[PDB]
């Protein structure tokens, strides 16, 4: 059980794992156009942290993009494959992700969530009440009136995992 950061570096190994992650994202988010998932996962501004089983099988992951000078990151997609859900991997992934964001000097995580995900993100400590001013994300994150933007503050000295 490894949680490795994967980026489009053009090797066959990382590419196969990024396609496997894209395939988990489309099968677990069927409302999402599959061509839109491909475009963000393989965009040079996005990175993906995968949950690697036996150092070769991707069973989950989180695709995100950092706004390094602004110190915030928006979570693109997050999913765990169906046959590996309710095994606590999703929480271990979010904790490993927040630990990496703390090391990347990222202060806030933002994500658009609607319906059930408002609840899953509230359990991972994301709130609908923002602490970060609206003008800090405007012009970097898209303002949709159709979703609920949730934010999680990453304090520099909180330990993330249990």
């Amino acid at each position: 059980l490894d949680f490795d950061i994967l980026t489009n570096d053009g090797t066959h190994r990382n590419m196969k794992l990024l396609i496997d992650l894209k395939n988990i994202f489309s099968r677990q988010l069927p409302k999402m156009p599959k061509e839109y998932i491909v475009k963000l996962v393989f965009d040079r501004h996005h990175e993906s942290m995968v949950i690697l089983k036996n150092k070769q099988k991707v069973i989950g992951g989180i695709c995100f993009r950092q706004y390094k000078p602004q110190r915030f990151a928006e979570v693109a997609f997050l999913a765990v494959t169906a046959n590996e859900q309710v095994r606590g991997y999703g929480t271990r992934l979010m904790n490993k992700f927040k630990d990496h964001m703390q090391k990347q000097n990222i202060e806030y995580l933002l994500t658009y969530a609607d319906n059930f995900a408002i609840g899953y993100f509230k359990k991972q400590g994301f709130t609908k009440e923002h602490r970060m001013p609206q003008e800090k994300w405007k012009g970097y994150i898209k303002d949709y009136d159709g979703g609920t933007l949730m934010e999680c503050y990453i304090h520099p000295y909180v330990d993330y995992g249990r």
């Binding site: 988010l29 069927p30 409302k31 999402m32 963000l40 965009d43 501004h45 996005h46 695709c63 995100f64 993009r65 990151a73 928006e74 979570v75 693109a76 997609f77 997050l78 994500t111 658009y112 969530a113 609607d114 319906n115 059930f116 995900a117 899953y120 405007k138 012009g139 970097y140 994150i141 898209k142 303002d143 949709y144 979703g147």
Partner: peptide, 19 residues
């Protein structure tokens, strides 16, 4: 906005699933 490169927003309908 009117990005066409930006970050990403999910597609969580509601977890009892089919689309």
């Amino acid at each position: 906005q009117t990005a066409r490169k930006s970050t990403g927003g999910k597609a969580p309908r509601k977890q009892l699933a089919s689309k």
